[PDB]
Design an enzyme around this catalytic site. Structure first.
Site, short mmCIF file in Angstrom:
data_model
loop_
_atom_site.label_atom_id
_atom_site.label_comp_id
_atom_site.label_asym_id
_atom_site.label_seq_id
_atom_site.Cartn_x
_atom_site.Cartn_y
_atom_site.Cartn_z
N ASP A 15 0.82 -1.24 0.00
CA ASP A 15 0.00 0.00 0.00
C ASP A 15 0.85 1.29 0.00
O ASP A 15 0.30 2.41 0.21
CB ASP A 15 -1.04 -0.03 1.16
CG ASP A 15 -0.42 -0.10 2.50
OD1 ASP A 15 0.81 0.23 2.64
OD2 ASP A 15 -1.17 -0.41 3.46
N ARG A 29 0.88 6.74 0.03
CA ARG A 29 0.10 5.75 0.77
C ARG A 29 -1.29 5.70 0.16
O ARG A 29 -1.98 6.72 0.01
CB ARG A 29 0.04 6.18 2.23
CG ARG A 29 -0.83 5.31 3.14
CD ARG A 29 -0.31 3.92 3.32
NE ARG A 29 -0.96 3.13 4.38
CZ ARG A 29 -2.14 2.53 4.26
NH1 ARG A 29 -2.88 2.58 3.15
NH2 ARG A 29 -2.58 1.82 5.29
N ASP A 34 -5.73 -1.14 3.68
CA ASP A 34 -4.64 -1.59 4.54
C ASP A 34 -4.19 -2.93 4.05
O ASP A 34 -4.92 -3.93 4.17
CB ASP A 34 -5.05 -1.67 6.00
CG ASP A 34 -3.81 -1.78 6.97
OD1 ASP A 34 -2.71 -1.23 6.65
OD2 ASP A 34 -4.05 -2.34 8.05
N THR A 35 -2.99 -2.98 3.49
CA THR A 35 -2.33 -4.24 3.19
C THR A 35 -1.58 -4.74 4.43
O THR A 35 -1.20 -3.97 5.31
CB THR A 35 -1.38 -4.12 1.98
OG1 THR A 35 -0.50 -3.01 2.16
CG2 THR A 35 -2.21 -3.94 0.67
N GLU A 37 1.67 -5.88 6.48
CA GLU A 37 3.11 -5.57 6.33
C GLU A 37 3.82 -6.74 5.67
O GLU A 37 3.33 -7.86 5.71
CB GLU A 37 3.74 -5.17 7.66
CG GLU A 37 3.03 -4.04 8.41
CD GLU A 37 3.08 -2.67 7.73
OE1 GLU A 37 4.17 -2.36 7.20
OE2 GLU A 37 2.05 -1.91 7.75
N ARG A 75 3.55 11.37 3.62
CA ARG A 75 3.15 10.49 2.50
C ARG A 75 1.97 11.09 1.83
O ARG A 75 1.04 11.50 2.48
CB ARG A 75 2.80 9.08 3.01
CG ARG A 75 3.92 8.43 3.75
CD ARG A 75 3.59 7.02 4.14
NE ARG A 75 2.46 7.01 5.05
CZ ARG A 75 1.99 5.90 5.65
NH1 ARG A 75 2.58 4.74 5.50
NH2 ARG A 75 0.89 5.98 6.34
C1 LIG Z 1 -4.19 5.54 5.00
C2 LIG Z 1 -3.90 6.64 6.00
C3 LIG Z 1 -3.03 6.44 7.07
N1 LIG Z 1 -2.76 7.40 7.97
C4 LIG Z 1 -1.87 7.18 9.13
C5 LIG Z 1 -2.71 6.55 10.25
C6 LIG Z 1 -1.79 5.59 10.91
O1 LIG Z 1 -1.01 6.26 11.97
P1 LIG Z 1 -0.11 5.34 12.92
O2 LIG Z 1 1.24 5.09 12.22
O3 LIG Z 1 0.00 6.30 14.07
O4 LIG Z 1 -0.77 4.05 13.20
C7 LIG Z 1 -0.83 5.18 9.79
C8 LIG Z 1 -1.16 3.87 9.16
O5 LIG Z 1 -0.41 3.68 7.96
P2 LIG Z 1 0.30 2.30 7.62
O6 LIG Z 1 -0.83 1.33 7.46
O7 LIG Z 1 1.05 2.56 6.35
O8 LIG Z 1 1.20 1.97 8.79
O9 LIG Z 1 -0.94 6.19 8.84
C9 LIG Z 1 -3.43 8.64 7.87
O10 LIG Z 1 -3.17 9.53 8.71
N2 LIG Z 1 -4.28 8.88 6.87
C10 LIG Z 1 -4.57 7.94 5.91
O11 LIG Z 1 -5.39 8.19 5.04
CA LIG Z 2 -0.08 -1.48 5.88
#
Ligand SMILES: Cc1cn([C@H]2C[C@H](OP(=O)(O)O)[C@@H](COP(=O)(O)O)O2)c(=O)[nH]c1=O
Ligand SMILES: [Ca+2]
EC number: 3.1.31.1
Length: 129
Positions: A15, A29, A34-35, A37, A75
């Site tokens: 993702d 992103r 959510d893929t 890890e 991102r």
């Molecule tokens: C997809 C997405 C993730 N995020 C943030 C929330 C999550 O914060 P935390 O890192 O604090 O959990 C994290 C999840 O992304 P990843 O799934 O790439 O880890 O990215 C956003 O803020 N907005 C979005 O649209």
């Molecule tokens: Ca992920």
């Protein structure tokens, strides 16, 4: 919403990826998904799926939603298309991503993706197996 050009710089995982957008390198992103890890179950499969979908494409495009365009980690947040096909939806349809992170104001394609998830689940694909 509208599509804008980009080019692939590098795959990262299911993702996230590095694209060139308005001539600058950015990590993107995928919105609303959510893929797993890479170290998790189906992570490698998701990463391969996303990698291949962009390598095979002639034309990569990004589509921002109405809201925030970058997250707290810098991102870019987008829907990404490979030859007109949305990567975010294709991942969900194949059971390689869950619908997730549905924040108000960047949720234009939620119910399109939720429909894909339901079909993935019915077919018991990948994550739903
Ligand atoms: C997809 C997405 C993730 N995020 C943030 C929330 C999550 O914060 P935390 O890192 O604090 O959990 C994290 C999840 O992304 P990843 O799934 O790439 O880890 O990215 C956003 O803020 N907005 C979005 O649209
Ligand atoms: Ca992920």
């Amino acid at each position: 919403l509208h599509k804008e050009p980009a080019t692939l710089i590098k795959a990262i995982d299911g993702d996230t990826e590095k694209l060139m957008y308005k001539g600058q390198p950015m990590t993107f992103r995928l919105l609303l998904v959510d893929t797993p890890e890479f170290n998790e179950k189906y992570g490698p499969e998701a990463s391969a799926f996303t990698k291949k979908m962009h390598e095979n494409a002639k034309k990569i495009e990004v589509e921002f939603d109405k809201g925030q365009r970058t997250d707290k980690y810098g991102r870019g947040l987008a829907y990404i298309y490979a030859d007109g096909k949305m990567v975010n939806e294709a991942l969900v349809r194949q059971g390689l991503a869950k619908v997730a992170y549905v924040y108000k104001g960047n949720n234009t394609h939620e119910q399109l993706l939720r429909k894909a998830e339901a079909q993935a689940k019915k077919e018991k694909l990948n994550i739903w197996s």
